[PDB]
C-alpha cells in the first residue's frame, strides 16, 4: 500500500515508563498509530475509493500487486472519526463513533518504527478502566511478534509502513487484512455476510501472540498463543487456520491458547462488579514473564499475574478446577487445564511456552484495541461456551453474560458510548513496577 495523502496523519502521543527498580522509573515519550484496516483506501491520483464497504474497485485493484501500487492507506482523524484520544500516559478508545466500531493501535518508538519489547525475565504493568465495558466487548492489551518497521524493508510495495499501522499479525493468522506483505488481499476476497465493512481474503498474517489482557467488566483472560514460526509469516487459504478459516486448527498457530480466566478456573467471586477486583473502578494489572533459570536467556517457564486496587496487591486466585493446580501459567498447568476441560491441546502442538518464549526473544509489539466479535459474540470470554453445553461442566462457564449477549448489532446500538482507558504503562525487571 502507498502512504495516503487525502487526510493528514499525526500519531497521538502517549507516555510510558521504564523502571529499573521499585519506585525508580523514567519517562518515555511514545506515540500510537491506528491499524491499517481502519483507514480509507484511496486511489493515489484521484482520491476515490479503492475499497467501498466490503468490495474492491476492479480498475484500481484488478489483482493484489496492482492494487498495492494504485492505492493508499489514508491518514486518520483519531478523535473525530475513530474516538481515540490520549493525554499524558492515558489512551482512551471509544466504542462507536459514527459508523466506526472501536480501534486497534500500536505503540511507536518513532514515527516509522513500532516499539519492541523483550518480555523474557521482565514485568509489564498498566492501569485500566473497564467499568464501561459490558457483555460482548473486549478491551485488549497484548503483544504480537510483528516486524518493527511494519514490513517496509521486506516488501517494497508497502510504502505506508508502521507510520500507517501496517504489518499486523496474530495467532489467528488473520485473513481480514486488506494488505499483507505489500500485496492487497483482493484475489480471493470474500465479503462478510454480517459485517458491512469486512471480508476474508486468501492471504493471512500469522505470528505468536501474548494476550496479556482480554477483558471487560465481567471477565478477563491472560493467554499465550504459540506459532510454529514465531514471527510474522504469510499463510494462504484455509491452511491458515484461525478464526477466519474453515478449520481453526488447520494452520501453524494455536488459535485457542493456554488461558487463565479466574471465573473459568472456578473462582467467580474474584473479578467483576463489586468483586475482589472491583471492575466498577480502575485497577492495575501486573504480568511477569519468568524464565526457568531466572535470567534473560532462560526459557519462558511461568507467567504470573498480580492486581493492585486501592493500593492492595492481590495475586491471581488459584485454580479451583480438579486436576489443575496453582495461579500461574506453566507447562504443567496448561497440560492439565486442556485435559480437565476436554479441549484440544493445540498449545502443546505448536510448542507451548518454549515457542511463546522464542517469539518473545524476537521482540514483540504492544497492541491496544477495543472490539466486538462477529464470530462468537465474546461468549468465550464472558458467557457459557459453547452455548449448547451444560454450564456446570468445568470449562464451559467463563462469565455471567447470557448466551444471547454480545451480538454486534445489539451492543453497537445499546452501548455506543462504551470505552476502555489504558494508562500508566510501566515496564522493567521483575518486581520493578509495583510493591512486591
Ligand atoms: C477466590 O480467590 C480469592 C483470592 O485468592 C480468595 O480470597 C482469599 O481467601 C483466603 C481465604 O479466606 C484469604 O486468606 C486468608 O486471609 C486472612 C486475612 O488476610 C488471613 O488472616 C488468613 O491467614 C490464615 O490462613 C493462612 C492460610 O490460608 C495462614 O498462612 C495464616 O498464617 C493464617 O492462619 C488467610 O491468609 C485471602 O485474603 C483472600 N484474598 C482476598 C484478596 O480476598 C477466595 O477465597 C476465592 N474464593 C473461592 C470461593 O475459592
Ligand atoms: O474499510 C475502510 C473503513 O474502515 C472502517 O473500519 C473498520 C474496518 O474496515 C474493519 O476492517 C475493522 O474490522 C475489525 C473488526 O471489526 C474487529 O472485530 C476485529 O477485532 C480484532 C481486534 O482488533 C484484535 O485486537 C483481536 O485480537 O482480534 C479481533 C478479531 O479479529 O478487527 C478487525 C480489523 O482487523 O473494523 C473497523 C471498525 O469498524 C472505518 O470505520 C471507516 O472509517 C473506513 O472507511
Ligand atoms: O474462537 C473464539 C475464541 O476462542 C478462544 O479459545 C477458546 C476455544 O475456542 C474454546 O474451544 C475453548 O474451550 O476455550 C478457549 C479459551 O476461551 C481463543 O482464546 C480466542 O482468542 C478466540 O477469540
Ligand atoms: C519478587 O518479589 C517476590 C515477592 O517478594 C519474591 O518472592 C521474588 O523472589 C522476587 N523476584 C526477584 C527476581 O527478586
Coordinates of C-alpha atoms and ligand atoms in Angstrom, one line a residue:
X1 CA 0.0 0.0 0.0
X2 CA 1.0 3.6 -0.6
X3 CA 1.1 6.3 2.1
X4 CA -2.1 8.2 1.9
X5 CA -2.4 12.0 1.4
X6 CA -6.1 12.8 1.5
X7 CA -6.2 13.1 5.3
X8 CA -3.1 14.0 7.3
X9 CA -1.6 11.5 9.7
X10 CA -0.3 12.6 13.1
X11 CA 0.3 9.9 15.8
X12 CA -1.3 10.7 19.2
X13 CA 1.4 11.0 21.9
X14 CA 1.5 8.6 24.8
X15 CA 4.0 8.4 27.6
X16 CA 5.0 5.3 29.4
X17 CA 7.7 4.3 31.9
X18 CA 10.8 2.2 32.0
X19 CA 11.6 1.1 35.6
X20 CA 15.0 -0.1 36.9
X21 CA 13.9 -0.9 40.5
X22 CA 10.7 -0.3 42.5
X23 CA 9.9 3.4 42.7
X24 CA 12.7 4.2 40.2
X25 CA 11.2 4.8 36.7
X26 CA 11.8 7.2 33.9
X27 CA 9.5 8.5 31.2
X28 CA 9.5 7.5 27.5
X29 CA 7.8 9.8 25.0
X30 CA 5.8 7.3 22.9
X31 CA 3.0 7.6 20.4
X32 CA 0.3 5.4 18.9
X33 CA -0.8 4.6 15.4
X34 CA -4.1 3.2 14.1
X35 CA -4.0 -0.2 12.3
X36 CA -4.2 -0.1 8.5
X37 CA -7.6 -1.9 8.2
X38 CA -9.4 1.1 9.7
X39 CA -8.2 3.5 7.1
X40 CA -9.8 4.7 3.9
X41 CA -8.1 3.1 0.9
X42 CA -7.9 5.8 -1.8
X43 CA -6.6 5.7 -5.3
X44 CA -3.3 7.6 -5.3
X45 CA -4.3 10.0 -8.1
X46 CA -7.9 10.9 -7.8
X47 CA -8.8 10.3 -4.1
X48 CA -11.6 7.9 -4.9
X49 CA -12.4 4.6 -3.4
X50 CA -10.2 1.5 -4.0
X51 CA -12.4 -0.3 -1.4
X52 CA -16.0 0.6 -0.7
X53 CA -18.0 -1.1 2.1
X54 CA -16.5 -4.6 1.6
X55 CA -15.6 -4.7 -2.1
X56 CA -12.6 -3.6 -4.1
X57 CA -12.6 -1.4 -7.3
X58 CA -11.7 -3.5 -10.3
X59 CA -9.9 -0.8 -12.2
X60 CA -7.5 0.2 -9.3
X61 CA -7.4 -3.4 -7.9
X62 CA -7.6 -6.0 -10.7
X63 CA -5.0 -8.1 -8.8
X64 CA -3.1 -7.9 -5.5
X65 CA 0.0 -6.3 -6.7
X66 CA -1.6 -3.6 -9.0
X67 CA -3.9 -2.7 -6.1
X68 CA -1.0 -2.1 -3.7
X69 CA 0.6 0.1 -6.4
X70 CA -2.5 2.1 -7.1
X71 CA -4.0 2.5 -3.6
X72 CA -3.0 4.3 -0.5
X73 CA -3.9 4.0 3.2
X74 CA -5.3 7.4 4.3
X75 CA -4.4 9.3 7.4
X76 CA -6.7 9.1 10.4
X77 CA -8.7 11.7 12.3
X78 CA -8.1 9.9 15.5
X79 CA -10.6 11.7 17.8
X80 CA -13.3 12.7 15.3
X81 CA -13.5 9.6 13.2
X82 CA -12.2 6.8 15.5
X83 CA -12.9 8.0 19.0
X84 CA -9.3 7.7 20.0
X85 CA -7.8 10.3 22.4
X86 CA -4.7 10.5 24.6
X87 CA -3.5 12.6 27.4
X88 CA -0.2 12.1 29.3
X89 CA 0.1 8.3 30.0
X90 CA -3.6 7.7 29.2
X91 CA -5.1 6.3 26.0
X92 CA -9.0 6.2 25.7
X93 CA -10.7 4.1 23.0
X94 CA -14.3 4.8 22.4
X95 CA -16.6 2.1 21.0
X96 CA -19.0 3.6 18.4
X97 CA -18.1 6.9 16.6
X98 CA -20.4 7.4 13.6
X99 CA -20.2 4.2 11.6
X100 CA -16.8 3.3 13.1
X101 CA -16.5 0.5 15.7
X102 CA -13.5 0.5 18.1
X103 CA -9.9 0.6 17.0
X104 CA -6.6 -1.2 17.2
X105 CA -3.4 0.8 18.0
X106 CA 0.3 0.1 18.2
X107 CA 2.9 1.7 20.4
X108 CA 5.6 3.5 18.4
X109 CA 9.3 4.0 19.2
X110 CA 9.4 6.6 16.4
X111 CA 7.2 7.7 13.5
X112 CA 8.2 4.8 11.4
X113 CA 9.0 2.1 14.0
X114 CA 7.0 0.1 16.5
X115 CA 8.4 -0.1 20.0
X116 CA 9.8 -3.5 20.5
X117 CA 9.6 -5.1 23.9
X118 CA 11.8 -8.1 25.0
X119 CA 9.5 -9.7 27.6
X120 CA 11.7 -12.6 28.9
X121 CA 12.5 -12.1 32.6
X122 CA 10.6 -8.9 32.6
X123 CA 7.4 -7.4 34.1
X124 CA 4.7 -5.2 32.4
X125 CA 2.2 -3.2 34.3
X126 CA -0.7 -1.0 33.2
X127 CA -3.8 0.7 34.7
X128 CA -7.2 0.1 33.1
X129 CA -10.7 1.3 33.4
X130 CA -13.1 -1.4 32.2
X131 CA -16.1 0.0 34.1
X132 CA -17.9 0.9 30.8
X133 CA -17.3 -2.4 29.0
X134 CA -20.4 -4.6 29.1
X135 CA -21.1 -8.1 27.8
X136 CA -19.7 -8.6 24.3
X137 CA -17.0 -6.0 24.3
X138 CA -13.2 -6.7 24.7
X139 CA -10.7 -4.1 25.6
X140 CA -7.5 -6.0 24.7
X141 CA -3.8 -5.1 25.6
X142 CA -1.4 -7.6 24.2
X143 CA 1.8 -8.3 22.3
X144 CA 2.4 -9.8 18.9
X145 CA 5.6 -10.6 17.0
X146 CA 5.2 -8.0 14.3
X147 CA 8.2 -6.6 12.4
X148 CA 9.2 -3.3 14.0
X149 CA 9.2 -1.5 10.6
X150 CA 5.7 -2.8 9.6
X151 CA 7.1 -4.8 6.7
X152 CA 8.7 -2.0 4.7
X153 CA 12.2 -3.4 4.4
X154 CA 11.0 -6.8 3.1
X155 CA 8.1 -5.6 0.9
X156 CA 8.8 -2.7 -1.4
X157 CA 5.2 -2.2 -2.4
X158 CA 4.4 -1.4 1.2
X159 CA 5.3 2.3 1.2
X160 CA 3.0 3.1 4.1
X161 CA 4.7 1.2 6.8
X162 CA 4.4 1.5 10.6
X163 CA 3.6 5.2 10.1
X164 CA 0.2 3.9 8.8
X165 CA -0.2 0.8 11.0
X166 CA 0.8 -1.9 8.5
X167 CA 2.1 -5.3 9.3
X168 CA -0.3 -6.8 11.8
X169 CA -0.2 -10.5 12.6
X170 CA -1.5 -12.7 15.4
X171 CA -2.2 -16.3 16.3
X172 CA -5.5 -16.3 14.3
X173 CA -3.5 -15.8 11.1
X174 CA -6.0 -13.1 10.2
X175 CA -7.3 -13.1 6.6
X176 CA -9.4 -10.0 7.1
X177 CA -6.4 -7.7 6.5
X178 CA -6.7 -5.7 3.3
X179 CA -2.9 -5.5 2.8
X180 CA -0.4 -8.2 3.8
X181 CA 3.3 -8.3 2.8
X182 CA 3.0 -5.5 0.3
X183 CA 0.0 -7.0 -1.5
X184 CA -3.6 -6.3 -1.4
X185 CA -6.0 -9.1 -0.5
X186 CA -8.3 -8.8 -3.5
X187 CA -7.6 -12.1 -5.2
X188 CA -9.9 -14.5 -3.3
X189 CA -11.7 -11.7 -1.4
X190 CA -15.0 -12.8 0.1
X191 CA -17.1 -10.1 1.7
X192 CA -18.6 -10.8 5.1
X193 CA -22.3 -11.6 5.2
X194 CA -22.6 -9.9 8.6
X195 CA -20.2 -7.0 8.7
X196 CA -20.7 -4.3 6.0
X197 CA -17.0 -3.3 6.3
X198 CA -15.1 -6.5 6.2
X199 CA -14.2 -9.6 4.3
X200 CA -11.8 -12.6 4.2
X201 CA -9.1 -13.0 1.6
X202 CA -6.7 -15.7 0.6
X203 CA -3.8 -14.2 2.5
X204 CA -3.4 -14.4 6.2
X205 CA -0.8 -13.0 8.6
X206 CA 0.5 -15.3 11.3
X207 CA 2.6 -14.7 14.4
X208 CA 2.8 -15.6 18.0
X209 CA 0.6 -13.6 20.4
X210 CA 0.9 -13.0 24.1
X211 CA -2.6 -11.9 25.2
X212 CA -1.8 -10.1 28.4
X213 CA -5.2 -8.7 28.8
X214 CA -8.6 -9.5 27.1
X215 CA -11.3 -8.2 29.3
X216 CA -14.5 -6.4 30.1
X217 CA -16.2 -5.5 33.4
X218 CA -17.4 -9.2 33.6
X219 CA -14.4 -11.3 32.9
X220 CA -10.7 -11.3 31.9
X221 CA -8.3 -13.8 30.4
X222 CA -4.5 -14.0 30.1
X223 CA -3.4 -16.3 27.2
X224 CA -0.2 -17.1 25.4
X225 CA -0.6 -18.4 21.8
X226 CA 2.5 -20.0 20.1
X227 CA 3.1 -20.4 16.4
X228 CA 5.4 -22.8 14.6
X229 CA 7.2 -19.7 13.2
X230 CA 7.4 -17.2 16.0
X231 CA 7.5 -14.0 13.8
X232 CA 5.3 -12.7 11.1
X233 CA 4.6 -15.0 8.1
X234 CA 2.1 -15.2 5.3
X235 CA -0.3 -18.1 5.0
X236 CA -2.8 -18.9 2.2
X237 CA -6.3 -20.1 2.2
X238 CA -7.9 -22.5 4.6
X239 CA -4.4 -23.8 5.6
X240 CA -4.2 -20.5 7.6
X241 CA -6.4 -22.0 10.2
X242 CA -7.6 -19.5 12.8
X243 CA -11.0 -17.9 13.3
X244 CA -11.3 -16.8 9.6
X245 CA -10.8 -20.3 8.1
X246 CA -13.0 -23.4 7.8
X247 CA -11.0 -25.3 10.4
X248 CA -9.4 -23.2 13.1
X249 CA -6.8 -26.0 13.7
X250 CA -5.6 -26.4 10.1
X251 CA -2.7 -24.0 10.4
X252 CA 0.6 -23.2 12.1
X253 CA -0.6 -21.2 15.1
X254 CA -2.6 -22.2 18.3
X255 CA -5.9 -20.3 17.9
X256 CA -7.1 -21.2 21.5
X257 CA -4.0 -20.6 23.6
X258 CA -3.4 -21.6 27.2
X259 CA -5.8 -19.3 29.0
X260 CA -6.3 -18.3 32.6
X261 CA -9.7 -16.6 33.3
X262 CA -10.3 -16.8 37.0
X263 CA -14.1 -17.3 36.5
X264 CA -13.4 -20.2 34.1
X265 CA -10.9 -21.5 36.6
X266 CA -13.6 -21.8 39.2
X267 CA -13.5 -18.6 41.2
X268 CA -16.5 -16.5 40.2
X269 CA -16.1 -14.0 43.1
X270 CA -12.7 -12.8 42.2
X271 CA -13.2 -10.4 39.3
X272 CA -16.2 -8.3 38.3
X273 CA -18.5 -5.6 39.6
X274 CA -18.1 -5.3 43.4
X275 CA -15.8 -8.3 43.4
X276 CA -12.4 -8.7 45.0
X277 CA -11.1 -6.8 42.0
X278 CA -14.0 -4.4 41.5
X279 CA -14.4 -3.6 37.9
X280 CA -16.6 -0.6 38.6
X281 CA -13.3 1.2 39.4
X282 CA -9.9 1.4 37.7
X283 CA -7.2 -1.1 38.7
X284 CA -3.6 -2.1 37.9
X285 CA -2.7 -5.3 36.1
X286 CA 0.9 -6.7 36.5
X287 CA 2.2 -9.5 34.4
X288 CA 5.5 -11.3 34.9
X289 CA 7.3 -13.4 32.3
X290 CA 9.6 -15.7 34.3
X291 CA 12.3 -18.0 32.9
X292 CA 13.4 -21.4 34.1
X293 CA 16.8 -20.1 35.4
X294 CA 15.6 -16.5 36.3
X295 CA 17.9 -15.0 33.7
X296 CA 17.3 -13.1 30.4
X297 CA 18.4 -16.1 28.4
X298 CA 16.4 -18.8 30.2
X299 CA 13.4 -20.5 28.7
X300 CA 10.0 -18.9 29.4
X301 CA 8.6 -21.1 32.3
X302 CA 5.9 -19.2 34.1
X303 CA 3.5 -16.3 33.5
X304 CA 2.3 -14.7 36.8
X305 CA -0.4 -12.1 37.4
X306 CA -1.0 -9.6 40.2
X307 CA -3.6 -6.9 40.5
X308 CA -3.4 -3.7 42.5
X309 CA -6.5 -1.8 43.6
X310 CA -6.7 0.7 46.4
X311 CA -3.0 0.1 46.9
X312 CA -3.7 -3.6 47.8
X313 CA -1.6 -6.1 45.9
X314 CA -3.7 -9.1 45.1
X315 CA -2.3 -12.2 43.4
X316 CA -4.3 -14.1 40.8
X317 CA -6.6 -16.6 42.6
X318 CA -5.7 -20.3 42.5
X319 CA -7.5 -22.6 40.1
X320 CA -10.4 -24.4 41.7
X321 CA -10.7 -26.9 38.9
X322 CA -10.0 -30.5 39.9
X323 CA -6.7 -31.6 38.3
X324 CA -5.4 -28.1 37.7
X325 CA -3.2 -26.5 40.3
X326 CA -2.0 -23.0 41.0
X327 CA -2.5 -19.5 39.9
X328 CA 0.0 -19.1 37.1
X329 CA 0.6 -20.3 33.5
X330 CA 3.2 -23.1 33.3
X331 CA 3.5 -26.2 31.1
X332 CA 2.1 -28.4 33.8
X333 CA -0.9 -26.0 34.3
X334 CA -1.6 -25.9 30.5
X335 CA -1.4 -29.6 30.0
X336 CA -3.7 -30.2 33.0
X337 CA -6.2 -27.5 32.0
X338 CA -6.7 -28.8 28.5
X339 CA -7.2 -32.3 29.9
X340 CA -9.7 -31.2 32.6
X341 CA -11.7 -29.1 30.1
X342 CA -11.6 -31.6 27.3
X343 CA -10.1 -29.1 25.0
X344 CA -7.6 -30.0 22.3
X345 CA -4.1 -29.3 23.3
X346 CA -3.1 -27.2 20.4
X347 CA -0.9 -25.1 22.7
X348 CA 1.4 -28.1 23.1
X349 CA 1.2 -29.0 19.4
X350 CA 2.6 -25.6 18.5
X351 CA 5.4 -25.6 21.0
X352 CA 3.8 -24.2 24.1
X353 CA 5.9 -21.8 26.3
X354 CA 9.1 -22.7 24.5
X355 CA 7.7 -21.3 21.2
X356 CA 6.0 -18.4 23.0
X357 CA 9.3 -17.6 24.6
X358 CA 11.1 -17.8 21.2
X359 CA 8.7 -15.2 19.9
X360 CA 9.4 -13.1 23.0
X361 CA 13.1 -13.4 22.2
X362 CA 12.5 -12.0 18.7
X363 CA 10.8 -8.9 20.1
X364 CA 7.1 -8.0 20.3
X365 CA 4.9 -5.0 19.6
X366 CA 2.3 -3.6 22.1
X367 CA -1.3 -3.6 20.8
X368 CA -4.2 -1.9 22.5
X369 CA -7.7 -2.5 21.0
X370 CA -11.4 -2.4 21.6
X371 CA -13.6 -4.8 19.7
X372 CA -16.8 -6.8 19.4
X373 CA -17.0 -10.3 18.0
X374 CA -18.6 -11.0 14.7
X375 CA -17.7 -14.8 15.1
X376 CA -18.6 -15.7 18.6
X377 CA -20.1 -12.7 20.4
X378 CA -17.3 -12.7 23.0
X379 CA -19.1 -15.6 24.6
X380 CA -15.8 -17.5 25.1
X381 CA -14.7 -14.6 27.4
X382 CA -17.8 -13.8 29.4
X383 CA -20.6 -16.4 28.9
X384 CA -21.2 -20.1 28.7
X385 CA -19.4 -21.5 25.7
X386 CA -20.1 -23.5 23.6
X387 CA -23.7 -22.4 24.2
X388 CA -25.1 -26.0 23.9
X389 CA -23.1 -27.4 26.8
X390 CA -24.1 -27.7 30.4
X391 CA -22.8 -24.6 32.2
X392 CA -21.9 -26.7 35.3
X393 CA -19.3 -28.7 33.3
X394 CA -15.8 -27.5 34.0
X395 CA -14.6 -25.1 31.3
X396 CA -17.9 -24.0 30.0
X397 CA -18.8 -21.0 32.2
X398 CA -16.5 -18.0 31.6
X399 CA -18.6 -15.2 33.0
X400 CA -22.2 -14.1 33.9
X401 CA -23.4 -13.0 30.4
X402 CA -26.3 -14.8 28.8
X403 CA -25.6 -16.8 25.7
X404 CA -27.7 -14.4 23.6
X405 CA -25.4 -11.5 24.6
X406 CA -22.8 -9.8 22.5
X407 CA -24.4 -9.7 19.1
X408 CA -22.6 -6.8 17.3
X409 CA -25.8 -5.1 16.1
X410 CA -27.2 -5.2 19.7
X411 CA -24.1 -3.9 21.5
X412 CA -23.3 -1.3 18.9
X413 CA -26.8 0.1 19.3
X414 CA -27.1 -0.3 23.1
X415 CA -23.6 0.6 24.2
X416 CA -22.2 3.1 21.7
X417 CA -20.6 5.3 24.5
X418 CA -18.7 2.4 26.0
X419 CA -14.9 2.8 26.1
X420 CA -11.7 1.4 27.5
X421 CA -8.9 3.5 29.0
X422 CA -5.4 2.2 29.4
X423 CA -2.8 4.3 31.4
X424 CA 0.3 4.3 33.4
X425 CA 2.3 1.7 31.4
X426 CA 5.4 0.6 33.2
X427 CA 8.0 -2.0 32.1
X428 CA 11.2 -3.3 33.6
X429 CA 12.8 -6.1 35.6
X430 CA 10.8 -8.4 37.8
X431 CA 9.3 -6.5 40.8
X432 CA 10.3 -3.1 39.4
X433 CA 6.9 -1.8 38.5
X434 CA 4.9 -2.4 41.8
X435 CA 5.3 -3.1 45.5
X436 CA 6.0 -6.9 45.6
Ligands
LIG1 C1 -11.3 -16.6 45.1 O1 -10.0 -16.1 45.2 C2 -9.7 -15.2 46.2 C3 -8.4 -14.6 46.0 O2 -7.4 -15.6 46.1 C4 -9.8 -15.9 47.6 O3 -9.7 -15.0 48.6 C5 -8.7 -15.3 49.6 O4 -9.2 -16.1 50.5 C6 -8.4 -16.5 51.6 C7 -9.1 -17.5 52.5 O5 -10.2 -16.9 53.0 C8 -7.8 -15.3 52.3 O6 -6.7 -15.7 53.1 C9 -6.9 -15.5 54.5 O7 -6.9 -14.1 54.7 C10 -7.0 -13.8 56.0 C11 -7.0 -12.2 56.1 O8 -5.9 -11.7 55.4 C12 -5.8 -14.3 56.8 O9 -5.9 -14.0 58.2 C13 -5.6 -15.8 56.6 O10 -4.4 -16.2 57.3 C14 -4.5 -17.5 57.9 O11 -4.5 -18.6 57.0 C15 -3.4 -18.7 56.2 C16 -3.5 -19.8 55.2 O12 -4.6 -19.5 54.3 C17 -2.1 -18.9 57.1 O13 -1.0 -19.0 56.3 C18 -2.0 -17.7 58.1 O14 -0.9 -17.9 58.9 C19 -3.3 -17.6 58.8 O15 -3.5 -18.8 59.7 C20 -5.6 -16.1 55.2 O16 -4.4 -15.7 54.5 C21 -7.3 -14.2 51.3 O17 -7.0 -13.0 52.0 C22 -8.4 -13.9 50.3 N1 -7.8 -13.0 49.3 C23 -8.5 -11.8 49.0 C24 -7.8 -10.8 48.2 O18 -9.7 -11.7 49.4 C25 -11.2 -16.5 47.7 O19 -11.3 -17.3 48.8 C26 -11.6 -17.4 46.4 N2 -12.9 -17.8 46.5 C27 -13.3 -19.1 46.5 C28 -14.7 -19.4 46.7 O20 -12.4 -20.0 46.3
LIG2 O1 -12.6 -0.1 5.2 C1 -12.5 1.3 5.5 C2 -13.3 1.7 6.7 O2 -12.8 1.1 7.8 C3 -13.7 1.2 8.9 O3 -13.1 0.5 10.0 C4 -13.5 -0.9 10.1 C5 -12.6 -1.8 9.2 O4 -13.0 -1.7 7.8 C6 -12.7 -3.2 9.6 O5 -11.7 -4.0 8.9 C7 -12.4 -3.4 11.0 O6 -12.6 -4.8 11.3 C8 -12.2 -5.2 12.6 C9 -13.3 -5.9 13.4 O7 -14.5 -5.1 13.5 C10 -12.8 -6.3 14.7 O8 -13.8 -7.2 15.3 C11 -11.5 -7.0 14.7 O9 -11.1 -7.1 16.0 C12 -9.9 -7.8 16.3 C13 -9.1 -7.0 17.3 O10 -8.7 -5.7 16.8 C14 -7.9 -7.7 17.9 O11 -7.4 -6.9 18.9 C15 -8.4 -9.1 18.3 O12 -7.3 -9.7 18.9 O13 -8.9 -9.8 17.3 C16 -10.1 -9.2 16.8 C17 -10.8 -10.1 15.8 O14 -10.1 -10.2 14.6 O15 -10.6 -6.3 14.0 C18 -10.9 -6.1 12.6 C19 -9.8 -5.5 11.8 O16 -8.7 -6.4 11.8 O17 -13.4 -2.7 11.7 C20 -13.2 -1.3 11.5 C21 -14.0 -0.6 12.6 O18 -15.4 -0.6 12.3 C22 -13.7 2.7 9.4 O19 -14.6 2.8 10.4 C23 -14.1 3.6 8.2 O20 -13.8 4.9 8.6 C24 -13.3 3.2 7.0 O21 -13.8 3.9 5.9
LIG3 O1 -12.7 -18.6 18.7 C1 -13.1 -17.8 19.8 C2 -12.0 -17.6 20.8 O2 -11.5 -18.9 21.2 C3 -10.7 -18.8 22.3 O3 -10.3 -20.2 22.6 C4 -11.3 -20.9 23.3 C5 -11.8 -22.0 22.4 O4 -12.5 -21.6 21.2 C6 -12.8 -23.0 23.1 O5 -13.0 -24.2 22.3 C7 -12.1 -23.4 24.4 O6 -13.0 -24.3 25.1 O7 -11.8 -22.3 25.2 C8 -10.8 -21.5 24.6 C9 -10.5 -20.3 25.5 O8 -11.6 -19.5 25.7 C10 -9.4 -18.0 22.0 O9 -8.7 -18.0 23.1 C11 -9.9 -16.7 21.5 O10 -8.8 -16.0 21.1 C12 -10.9 -16.7 20.3 O11 -11.1 -15.3 20.1
LIG4 C1 10.0 -10.6 43.5 O1 9.3 -10.4 44.8 C2 8.8 -11.6 45.3 C3 7.9 -11.2 46.5 O2 8.7 -10.6 47.5 C4 9.9 -12.6 45.6 O3 9.3 -13.8 46.0 C5 10.7 -12.8 44.4 O4 11.8 -13.6 44.7 C6 11.2 -11.5 43.7 N1 11.8 -11.8 42.5 C7 13.1 -11.5 42.2 C8 13.7 -11.9 40.9 O5 13.8 -10.8 43.0

